[PDB]
Amino acid sequence: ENKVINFKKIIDSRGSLVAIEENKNIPFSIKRVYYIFDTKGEEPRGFNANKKLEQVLVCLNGSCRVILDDGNIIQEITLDSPAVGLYVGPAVWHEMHDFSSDCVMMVLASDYYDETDYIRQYDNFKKYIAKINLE
Amino acid sequence: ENKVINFKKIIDSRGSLVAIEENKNIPFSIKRVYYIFDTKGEEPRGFNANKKLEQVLVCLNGSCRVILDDGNIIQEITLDSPAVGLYVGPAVWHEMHDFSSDCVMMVLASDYYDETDYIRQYDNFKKYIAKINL
Ligand SMILES: Cc1cn([C@H]2C[C@H](O)[C@@H](COP(=O)(O)OP(=O)(O)O)O2)c(=O)[nH]c1=O
Numbered sequence A: 001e002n003k004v005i006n007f008k009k010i011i012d013s014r015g016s017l018v019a020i021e022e023n024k025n026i027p028f029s030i031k032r033v034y035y036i037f038d039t040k041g042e043e044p045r046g047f048n049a050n051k052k053l054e055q056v057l058v059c060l061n062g063s064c065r066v067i068l069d070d071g072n073i074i075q076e077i078t079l080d081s082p083a084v085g086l087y088v089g090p091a092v093w094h095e096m097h098d099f100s101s102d103c104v105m106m107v108l109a110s111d112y113y114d115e116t117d118y119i120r121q122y123d124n125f126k127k128y129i130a131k132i133n134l135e
Numbered sequence B: 001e002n003k004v005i006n007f008k009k010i011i012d013s014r015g016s017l018v019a020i021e022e023n024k025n026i027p028f029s030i031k032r033v034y035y036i037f038d039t040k041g042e043e044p045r046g047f048n049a050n051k052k053l054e055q056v057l058v059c060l061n062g063s064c065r066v067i068l069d070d071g072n073i074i075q076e077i078t079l080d081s082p083a084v085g086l087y088v089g090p091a092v093w094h095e096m097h098d099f100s101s102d103c104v105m106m107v108l109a110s111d112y113y114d115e116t117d118y119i120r121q122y123d124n125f126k127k128y129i130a131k132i133n134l
């Protein structure tokens, strides 16, 4: 609704195609594009949040289960269609679970990588939130 | 000229990661990302060149065989690895073939989709270049 993104997909005799255009079908400017592949193992990914960064998650192949928490509510959504993007805003905790063996997960980011934008501790994250409420 | 870009790739028990950053590891600013999937049939694609667009192609899954003509040299390249990107500069002809079934192909473009920037006559492409040569 506010988080789930339905990208317009095109289909022909040849296949499918999806195009994402910076600040057209995504609320921000693209500066970085990262992706995860050749996954394996039972240990998740993510479990962190970001102060400034805005992102959009997309399961290009296979599937992945992702959790969300803006401190308030928690949401879960299983990405399994390249045509769907998930919006992860700043100040939103995230987790990437259950990567299918063939999963390819892509992320469109508003800025370059920067370890100091991270909130990797749940409590601080929570903390971070409350503080915020006050202001 | 080689047009291949090899991205640094992180590795751990979890899998692999590759990160592409506008103007950092790719000679241009990203304005659009598009990908092709659920491909079928025996028809290739591409077959055009762009006068202003700068792209980078990445085969995120499976594989695909690419042909790039810069007007000086033709290069055929099989992409079967997400950590390799091919740079398709302006006035560079390209074609995608041999898409595996599970093939997922991705393109990073320096600009929005503009049909008018597209040359779809190889011959014309060849001419445009010559002209360019002056
Ligand atoms: C997402 C991302 C990660 N990285 C680096 C940070 C780490 O050195 C590594 C893995 O990222 P991440 O999964 O966040 O690391 P960690 O194992 O601590 O959870 O990749 C970049 O360099 N650029 C990026 O865009």
Ligand SMILES: Cc1cn([C@H]2C[C@H](O)[C@@H](COP(=O)(O)OP(=O)(O)O)O2)c(=O)[nH]c1=O
Residues within 6 Å of the ligand: A010, A017, A019, B032, B034, B113
């Ligand atoms: C690559 C791309 C395609 N499309 C559309 C154009 C077409 O209607 C469809 C796929 O077409 P395309 O791959 O460009 O080739 P062709 O015109 O020969 O069919 O997707 C966009 O809207 N934006 C893009 O960035």
